[PDB]
Design a protein around this ligand. Structure first.
Ligand SMILES: Nc1ncnc2c1ncn2[C@@H]1O[C@H](COP(=O)(O)OP(=O)(O)OP(=O)(O)O)[C@@H](O)[C@H]1O
Ligand SMILES: Nc1ncnc2c1ncn2[C@@H]1O[C@H](COP(=O)(O)OP(=O)(O)OP(=O)(O)O)[C@@H](O)[C@H]1O
Ligand SMILES: [Mg+2]
Ligand SMILES: [Mg+2]
Lengths: 524, 96, 524, 183
């Protein structure tokens, strides 16, 4: 359609006004004293959130040029959320500070491309400085502190996440979901717990618990769905001769086969429970092979070559215990070679590395947790739905922050880490004076998180920033207690990945925005 | 070795003519399966209703023009294909 | 619909205003000091770009007559992008300069047709002068300089592109795609790397790498899809007697045949891996023939005449090594006659010459690269998606400019080449005075790129233009360092094809637009 | 620059039905020197219709070019295999145009090459086609796009009569497209 074209300073002013609107919406949620934001939803009740990414996503302005600026700087929060999972408000705070100071230099005749180059140089040096300044975050206490700081100073969330990571270890998978009660709960399940219930209620060995319980049973694994009995007379008869119970994993057991198995279940000749194979195409086979390796069995399939009629006891897998309910199937201490399990988990790790989709890698990690370590579910407890949504957002932020902390270490929280990095980068120089001005605007913007935290506290950002810069090391400002002290000893830790991602994404998008001279949009 | 029973014949179908009469090479359905083949084995003979078995008129080693259908069956012996067909399915015998 | 008709100077003024709007949007992105332009997108985030063609494409004005001028002069950037891949901002700068100076002569009573003739004569002489003034660009250093200049003075991009065409030679194919990391990466694959994975995971000889590996195997190439085993019993049996592994290329292998091949792969009688045939209708046959020629084999097809049952070892192709993964299959050192490969690549070259579609010639050149030389993929590394788009646009510009440099040579950059060409054409005369005025407006407009670069730097365009015209040869202005020197020795090279195409398309469109007297459009 | 491309004689835009007909791989063009030309109004897919024609052409030894509504399947397979085997040099290309036009220009090609069109309506059959029925041309060149017949051996009087008839159709035609096609 017909375009409105704006040039130079007026375009930059409109872009900055949009960036300021988005960042003002986002940055009132920075720190422990940061407040909440109400996002009106077209469907349902308004959302009360403190995440900067949500506020950034919701912001869209009437003016087309201001909206362009808003979307461009919203990219910072979106990328910071996608990469690190936390630090979206800090990323938006850093981006606007680079933009505001970068646009001031652009207005002073400085070359914006060289300003972008200087900002990039300063941020590369800053990332190196952060990697040097980080410390490993391995003990449970530091993880609890990271989770607490990332959950808006909620100690229970941090302790719960530390417990979850201790229980599921390194290879376990932790997910967060809604809870019924008013208190957060942790549900940790080890070994295999794929969500497939019994195909028939009559298999239930313990009616009081409504759960089939098999002690040291055989496990048959068939890739194909079965409806006739004629395929498994050898297997079932040999199981009866052995006398140990049997659990059937298959694409589908129904009709004559299911009725026969139920009849023999009451008759007591065999204790057989049949549950569906977990997953779907190209996934059911993978996790069936995983179950076979864990239980020391072999999968019966047409493609592999073997047939059910020729299946024997050695083909069937073995496990210490099997528990079946309406929803889930649990296998306890599958009798399988540790070398095979480690090899399979190594293969799944290779698939993780070669995977390019988040859903795929999370599914592969879930499979790993099924094989080695465990799966933890944190049920968030809240009185209402708005409280549930806000607390779940905070718990997910804490989960991502703890994961980033174990991945890349921790640094002093409250913006102290970037203050120290900026202090250590005071000797950095570019190729010309425009690049040095860009380095200086990056270094000044590195103080924006701390200043905005303090401003959210109601204190003086300049006073506290000067006092923190006067110190050294981990000396910073606890905004919750409004007192100066060692950031690590006070338990205020930021993941190094979170800070680095915020700084990098803010710097990239902000430099690109400050390099702009013309802006083309649609007419109002 | 395979030999038939009663009025049945084991025949080795000849290779389909790759080239036409004038030297044109025929491929696909053009080189259709040949209906003539040398007789490999002759059964004892057709049984009549009275109980006497009369020998088949065909002889071993004679090319016969036969008809494909339900009567003929394609069996394999020593990785080679042999047609088992009733003598009635044998339309003609090829001489000279 | 009802038309508004504008005559003479009113129409010319509105057309010029539209041209000025489009060219002002485009030309703020000229030179090393040229800035960026934000283009609002109806879907997604706004695009920050420095290409002139993107800005030109986005420009559409409210006024119908100004919009007519804008579209007409946007065609200059579109054609320059389609032809050379670079010089779109220079083409738009030249076009507007020819239009502005052409319309001044038209207002002074000169005959616009003779002005068009004079501009065309001057540009023909200028193209001859450029062809004479060019120098070959064959070494890697000049290629690095060309890529660096075309990537907005990004030395890493120039060096990466120089390395890419050093590795893939003249016949290789270089393409640019998104990367995951923060650094640009180069992935060069030689010989055949058609993107077809194994038809079944069970073929994998090396589970740790998840890749089937065959050492000196046979290659069967069937044009028809296969689902039964009986067709290739002679082939598989004879391969088993040979003992070497077998790789199957076919339209589709599935069902009983696939299960049989898998079972024998476990059994170890024959090491068989079957992957799908690359390409599609009328293309899959071409790729299969190329693979057969490279591997010294013959393609099994119904149309060709032979059948799979009669296939023999001499029919089957041979290769030194074969690797297969989930995605791609690579054949290393296919045992094939060099004369056959040279003949096949020559045939593909003739198909390139006879081809009229860009996609078709790109596919044919990719096939050539598969046969001879290699294929390089430049993965652009950027922190965000917007930076990814900007850097990928710059890298594609650099790739196109390097290709144009190897095709037609290089000239002094920074507008010096056109300045020198205009200096060498001061003695050019037409048939009448209107044609000489047109020649003069073309020669004056030939100084527009340098003046616009300098103006983007903030310096005085007239001062630097006079200083550059005072010099000779390759003496010009480095706008990045704001210093005078030899453009070739300073590493500022423009592809001769880029400059020639910009000048030619600008001249053609601009002359046509200055010949206009009436303008018919729809009523607002 | 403006270019002029002038093609004489018959150059109807129909390429080979199979790439394997190509005698000259460097140019990607089938080249037949003094070949026979068979012209069939019906589309063919089997082989049994032209064993007499193909065998007699192979006996003559001169190459063969086939113009037909469509040659496909077993027919193309047989002709291609015979082309590699060298028994007969056969190139089959589609008849140009569509209904009420393909017949007209096929008759034109027959007159130019001194042949007769094989059709059901005309009466004869492909099995009874003979060498005298088949047309003759001095040269034939086939590419992916165009088929060209050079110096078709045909009676001059027949050519002038046919062009006179086409001129009468031009006069009786009332549509610009029709007269353009006739020209
Ligand atoms: N008690 C505290 N004293 C000082 N700084 C604190 C305190 N608690 C948290 N912070 C700091 O608050 C900063 C950001 O907090 P917050 O969780 O609001 O934002 P974020 O992680 O950048 O974004 P998000 O809104 O997406 O969670 C961190 O740098 C952290 O160190
Ligand atoms: N350091 C430099 N000093 C002088 N001139 C330079 C320098 N770097 C680049 N140039 C010149 O900038 C001109 C155009 O640069 P730019 O890449 O912005 O535009 P373009 O190639 O015309 O178009 P596009 O915007 O489509 O890439 C070229 O003529 C080139 O010689
Ligand atoms: Mg947070
Ligand atoms: Mg360029």
């Amino acid at each position: 359609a017909a375009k409105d074209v704006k040039f130079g300073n007026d375009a930059r002013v409109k872009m900055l006004r949009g960036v300021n609107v988005l960042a003002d919406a986002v940055k009132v949620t920075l720190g422990p004293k940061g407040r909440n934001v109400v996002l009106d939803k077209s469907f349902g009740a308004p959302t009360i959130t403190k995440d900067g990414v949500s506020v950034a996503r919701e912001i869209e302005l009437e003016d087309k040029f201001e909206n362009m600026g808003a979307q461009m700087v919203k990219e910072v929060a979106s990328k910071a959320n996608d990469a690190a999972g936390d630090g979206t408000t800090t990323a938006t705070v850093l981006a606007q500070a680079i933009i505001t100071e970068g646009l001031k230099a652009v207005a002073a005749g400085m070359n914006p491309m060289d300003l972008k180059r200087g900002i990039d140089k300063a941020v590369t040096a800053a990332v190196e400085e952060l990697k040097a300044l980080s410390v490993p975050c391995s003990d449970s206490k530091a993880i609890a502190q990271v989770g607490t700081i990332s959950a808006n100073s909620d100690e229970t969330v941090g302790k719960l996440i530390a417990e979850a990571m201790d229980k599921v270890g390194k290879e376990g998978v932790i997910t967060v979901e809604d809870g019924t009660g008013l208190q957060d709960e942790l549900d940790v399940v080890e070994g295999m717990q794929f969500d497939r219930g019994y195909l028939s209620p009559y298999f239930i060995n313990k009616p009081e618990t409504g759960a089939v319980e098999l002690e040291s049973p055989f496990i048959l694994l068939a890739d194909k769905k079965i409806s006739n009995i004629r395929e498994m007379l050898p297997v079932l008869e040999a199981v009866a001769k052995a006398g140990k119970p049997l659990l059937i994993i298959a694409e589908d057991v129904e009709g004559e086969a299911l009725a026969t198995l139920v009849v023999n279940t009451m008759r007591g000749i065999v204790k057989v429970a049949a549950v569906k194979a977990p997953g779907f195409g190209d996934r059911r086979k993978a996790m069936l092979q995983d179950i076979a390796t864990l239980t020391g069995g072999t999968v019966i399939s047409e493609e592999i070559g073997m047939e059910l009629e020729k299946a024997t006891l050695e083909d069937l897998g073995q496990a210490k215990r099997v528990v079946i309910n309406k929803d889930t199937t649990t296998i306890i201490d599958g009798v399988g070679e540790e070398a095979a399990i480690q090899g399979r988990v190594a293969q799944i790790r290779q698939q993780i590395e070669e995977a390019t989709s988040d859903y795929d890698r999370e599914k592969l990690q879930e499979r790993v947790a099924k094989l080695a370590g465990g799966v933890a579910v944190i049920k968030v407890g809240a009185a209402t739905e708005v409280e549930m949504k806000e607390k779940k957002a905070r718990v997910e932020d804490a989960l991502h922050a703890t994961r980033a902390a174990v991945e890349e270490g921790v640094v002093a929280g409250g913006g102290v880490a970037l203050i120290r990095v900026a202090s250590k980068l005071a000797d950095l120089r570019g190729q010309n004076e425009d690049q040095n001005v860009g380095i200086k605007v990056a270094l000044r913007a590195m103080e924006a998180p701390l200043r905005q935290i303090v401003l959210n506290c109601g204190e003086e950002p300049s006073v506290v920033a000067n006092t923190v810069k006067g110190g050294d090391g981990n000396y910073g400002y606890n905004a919750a207690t409004e007192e100066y002290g060692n950031m690590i000893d006070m338990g205020i830790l930021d993941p190094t990945k979170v800070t680095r991602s915020a700084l990098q994404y803010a710097a990239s998008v902000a430099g690109l925005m400050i390099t702009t001279e013309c802006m083309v949009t649609d007419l109002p | 070795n395979i030999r038939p029973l009663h009025d049945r014949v084991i025949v080795k179908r000849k290779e389909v003519e790759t080239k036409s009469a004038g030297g044109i090479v025929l491929t696909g359905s053009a080189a259709a399966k040949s209906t003539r083949g040398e007789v490999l084995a002759v059964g004892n003979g057709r049984i009549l209703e009275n109980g006497e078995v009369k020998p088949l008129d065909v002889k071993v080693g004679d090319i016969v023009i036969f008809n494909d259908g339900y009567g003929v069956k394609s069996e394999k012996i020593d990785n080679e294909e042999v047609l088992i067909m009733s003598e009635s399915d044998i339309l003609a015998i090829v001489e000279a």
